[PDB]
Symmetry: D2
Subunit: 110 residues, 4 copies
C-alpha cells in the first residue's frame, strides 16, 4: 500500500468520515487523468488506492472534497476543496487537518 | 485592496520573501484564466493584485510557488506548489487575506474575510 | 514593540478578539513571575506588552486563554490554554511576533523573529 | 490504552523518533506531579503511558521536548518545548507536528 490518505476534523476532534477523495496523475499533455478515488472510513483513512506496480514516478494530485464535508455538518466553509500536488520519486501518507477556514496538510514518507 | 496574500517560513521563523503567486479565475467554460500574479515582498506580503471593480463574483485559485522557494534554500520539498481555491464575493464584496505557513513537507493555509 | 501576539480563529475566518494573554518570565529561583498581560484587539493583535528596556534576556511563557474564547462562542474546546515557551534576547535584542491559529481541538503557533 | 502521543517532523516528512515526552497530572495544590513518560518509537508514537484505572478525570499536561530533537539535527529551534494542557472528562490521541519555529497540536478523541 504505497499511498494512504488520513483526514482529521479540528472542530470536533475526530476522524473526518465519508470524505470523498480523488487522485489524479499528470498525463503527457499536462492534463489530469483520474487515477483512484474513494471515501474515508470510520477512522478517517483511505487505504488500497493503488499498487506498487501502478504507482510509477510522476506528478500526482490528491483532491479532498472538504466543502461537502462541512456542508453536511451545517457549517459554511471557505475552500472549494483541498488539493495536494506532489512528485513521486516510498510509502506516502498524506494527512489533512480540516477547519472551516483553514487546512493543513503534511506528508509522511517512510 | 480586496485580495492579500501573506506567506511565512516555519523553518527560519521569517516572512517568505520573493515567493511567486499566480491567481486564476474560473471562466465561463470551466477553464482557469490568468487573473493576476506577483511576488511577496520583504515582509512576506503581496498587495495590489486587483481592485474592487475587477474582483467580481467567481471561483478563484491562488497558486503559491513553494517548490522554487525551498529549492533556492537547498531544500527539496514535498509539494509542487500550494493551491487555495475559493468562491469570492458570493454575497457582495468582501476583503480576503490568504495566509500560508510553509515547511518543506507541510503547509497550512488560513483565510481571514472581512 | 519587541513583543507582539496575533491570534486568528480558524472556524470563523476572523481575528480572535478579546482573547486574554498572560506573559511570564522565569525567575532566578525557576518560578514563573508575571511579566505583562492584555487582551487582543478587534484586529486580533496585542501590542504594547513591554519595552526594549524591560524585555531583557530570559525564558518567557506566553499563555493564551483559548478556553474562555471558545466557551463564549458556545463551543467546549479541548485545551485549557495555549502556551508558548521560548528563550528571548539570547544574543541581543530581537523583535518577536507570536502568532496563534485556533480551532476547538487544534492550534498552531508560529514565531517570526527579526 | 486511553492516551497515545504521535509526533511528526514537518521538515523531513518523517516520524519524530526518540523524542522525550513527559505527562503530568494537576494535584490538589495546583502543582504538576509526574504521571508518565517515555520516548517516541520509530513510528513517532508513544503507547502504554497509562491504564483506564489510573487515568481518572483531571487536568493533564503533556510536555514534548522539541528543543533536544532539533538540536540533534543541528537546527536551532525557537520553543523550549511544546506543552498540551487539557481536561480529561475516552481514547485520546495527542498529535504534534513539529517545525523549528512552529508547531501544531491536535487532539483526536474517539
Ligand atoms: O498557521 C498560521 C499561523 Cl500560526 C499564523 C498566520 C498568520 C496570519 C497573519 C499574520 Cl499578519 C500573521 Cl503574523 C500570521 C497564518 C497561518 Cl496559516
Ligand atoms: O497538523 C497535523 C497534525 Cl497536528 C497531526 C496530523 C496527524 C497525522 C497522522 C496521524 Cl496518524 C495523526 Cl493521529 C495526526 C496531521 C496534521 Cl496536518
Amino acid at each position: 500500500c504505497p499511498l494512504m490518505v488520513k483526514v482529521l476534523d479540528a472542530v470536533r476532534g475526530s476522524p473526518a468520515i465519508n470524505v470523498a477523495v480523488h487522485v489524479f496523475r499528470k498525463a503527457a499533455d499536462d492534463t489530469w487523468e483520474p487515477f483512484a478515488s474513494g471515501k474515508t472510513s470510520e477512522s478517517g483513512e483511505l487505504h488500497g488506492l493503488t499498487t506498487e506496480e501502478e504507482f510509477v514516478e510522476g506528478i500526482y494530485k490528491v483532491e479532498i472534497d472538504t466543502k461537502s464535508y462541512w456542508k453536511a455538518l451545517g457549517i459554511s466553509p471557505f475552500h472549494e476543496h483541498a488539493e495536494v500536488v506532489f512528485t513521486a520519486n516510498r510509502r506516502y501518507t498524506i494527512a489533512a487537518l480540516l477547519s472551516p477556514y483553514s487546512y493543513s496538510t503534511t506528508a509522511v514518507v517512510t
